[PDB]
Amino acid sequence: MREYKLVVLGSGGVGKSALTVQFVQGIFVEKYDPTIEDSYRKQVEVDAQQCMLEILDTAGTEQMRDLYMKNGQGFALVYSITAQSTFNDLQDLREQILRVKDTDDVPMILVGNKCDLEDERVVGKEQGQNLARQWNNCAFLESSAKSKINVNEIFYDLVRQINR
Amino acid sequence: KPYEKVRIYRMDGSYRSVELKHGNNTTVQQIMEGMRLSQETQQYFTIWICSENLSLQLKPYHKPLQHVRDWPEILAELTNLDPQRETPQLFLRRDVRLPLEVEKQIEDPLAILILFDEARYNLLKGFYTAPDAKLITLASLLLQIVYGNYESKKHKQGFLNEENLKSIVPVTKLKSKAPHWTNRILHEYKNLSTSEGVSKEMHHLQRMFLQNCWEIPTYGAAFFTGQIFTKNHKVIPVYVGVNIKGLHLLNMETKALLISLKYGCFMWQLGDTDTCFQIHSMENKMSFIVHTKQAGLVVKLLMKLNGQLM
Ligand SMILES: Nc1nc2c(ncn2[C@@H]2O[C@H](COP(=O)(O)OP(=O)(O)NP(=O)(O)O)[C@@H](O)[C@H]2O)c(=O)[nH]1
Ligand SMILES: *Cc1c(O)ccc2ccc(-c3ccco3)cc12
Ligand SMILES: [Mg+2]
């Protein structure tokens, strides 16, 4: 059983905890409690093999961000399709990860969360795909923790990106 | 960051960092409020402080970081260990005083999940002594909970080896009794998946796992270490399990159930120098004495849990 260390990053409010708790515990956290630092563990089957996932749910701001990057194997970059500022903050995070790993071959995925709030949408799906294209054909997904849409795929794809 | 924090672990290796508004003077109750728990979930759990060989449930008024600071002195009072190889951590665990009738009415999915992880941990460790039939049923539920539905193309042959087995059977049985249970485990696993009369929702399956654990005599037990002398005299290391049902004795080496006594079918007496306590099992004309520096806590817990019963 191989162990995978995944880190969920993004600005506050985007749903980093909601996506993680939904995937690990099957519960939708309706409340809002700003996270200090949460670590979850979960055993999954990716490509017909048992994996052990240690998922690190991080804070929106504050700070030890460099420790997460040096130790993390895969990174989920999450924004809310509801807030434009959370989308713009992700470029600085992508460059910070490449700087610390000292490479561009880094398991990564761009996640646009809260796609169940299609009405209050500010960031478009094409603009998110355009960003992932710019990021060396990075993986891209629109997800919803409330509706359980594309939740399991976020962490399954990071596992395949580490196996390569 | 302009604040202090501490990690609160669970049995599955996960943790949650909470802010420390009053530094080392923060209480269990203030930390309990710092978690993502409602008053519904909070009534079933509390903060424990545990090292490798000592686990202590704390109270709302306790300051856990001063217990961390004072750990080497606490280990010297209660154990015969060297304090160097023992660093404690804080855990969120089931309240040992939680009555079984209250646990049986729990519906919160998070509370069920937290109770499920503790029970699974105690099962794989070998602390839950149950017949071979009850253990096979629990192993098949774990297969459904962890590996999903049964599929003949995947689980029929060459799947329940020992690395996969280690996660569904007690470690005390993995070598002796388990490798001959594989056919019986898959049949119940196969029956669980292909049966619409059983809810495959996650909190429902975990609730089922706990139902089979509630009949186990050592369920929810707080465990202490001690010594008994054979009735020429040989020392036998023992675990002393005290729960809402009664008192139980495990062979420390093999976790075999020596004796289990429901409340009202035995009496206890604390030793003179505190270093021991005596158990007179009525309706059996038989007694025994357990030597342990934790004998004071064992008797104190026995009184409170017995006094809880109506
Ligand atoms: N409608 C809807 N609300 C969501 C979704 N994901 C999260 N939320 C809501 O958004 C709020 C913030 O979610 P949260 O998971 O705490 O985000 P976070 O990134 O962990 N915040 P922080 O970085 O400060 O810890 C909560 O009220 C939560 O219910 C979603 O997919 N749909
Ligand atoms: C000492 C005590 C009292 O007075 C009331 C309730 C308690 C519940 C649990 C414990 C305990 C478990 C392990 C170690 O101590 C003590 C306790
Ligand atoms: Mg959060």
Numbering used by the authors:
A (entry chain B): 1 to 63, 67 to 167
B (entry chain A): 417 to 647, 652 to 730
Give the text the authors published on this PDB structure.
Herein, we characterize the 2-hydroxy-1-naphthaldehyde (HNA) fragment as a targeted covalent reversible ligand of a noncatalytic lysine (Lys720) of the Krev interaction trapped 1 (KRIT1) protein. The PPI between HEG1 and KRIT1 is believed to play an important role in controlling vascular development and permeability under normal and pathological conditions. The HEG1 binding domain of KRIT1 features three lysines, namely Lys475, Lys720, and Lys724; based on point mutation studies, these residues are essential for the interaction between HEG1 and KRIT1.14 The HNA was found to form a reversible imine adduct with Lys720, and SAR studies indicated that the HNA is the smallest/simplest 2-hydroxy-arylaldehyde that inhibits the HEG1-KRIT1 PPI. However, the interaction of HNA within the HEG1 binding pocket of KRIT1 induces proximity of the aldehyde moiety with the ε-amino group of Lys720, resulting in the specific targeting of this amino acid residue.
To evaluate the potential of the HNA as a site-directing fragment to identify HEG1-KRIT1 PPI inhibitors with potentially improved binding affinity and inhibition activity, we synthesized and screened a series of HNA derivatives bearing substitutions at the C6 or C7 position of the naphthalene ring. The C6 and C7 positions were selected for substitutions as an analysis of the available HNA-KRIT1 co-crystal structure indicated that these two positions may provide opportunities for analogs with improved complementarity to the HEG1 binding region of KRIT1. The co-crystal structures of 3, 5, and 6 in complex with KRIT1 revealed that these compounds exhibit similar binding modes as the parent HNA fragment, including the presence of the imine adduct between the aldehyde moiety of the HNA derivative and the ε-amino group of Lys720. However, compared to the unsubstituted HNA, derivatives 3, 5, and 6 established additional interactions with KRIT1. Additionally, both furan derivatives 5 and 6 were involved in hydrogen−π interactions with KRIT1 Gln473. Interestingly, the binding positions in the three crystal structures appeared nearly identical with the HNA binding pose generated in the MD simulations. Thus, the X-ray and activity data indicate that the binding affinity of the HNA for KRIT1, and the consequent inhibition activity of this fragment in the HEG1–KRIT1 PPI assay, respond to elements of SARs, and in turn highlight the importance of structure complementarity and templating effects in promoting the formation of specific and relatively stable imine adducts with KRIT1 Lys720.
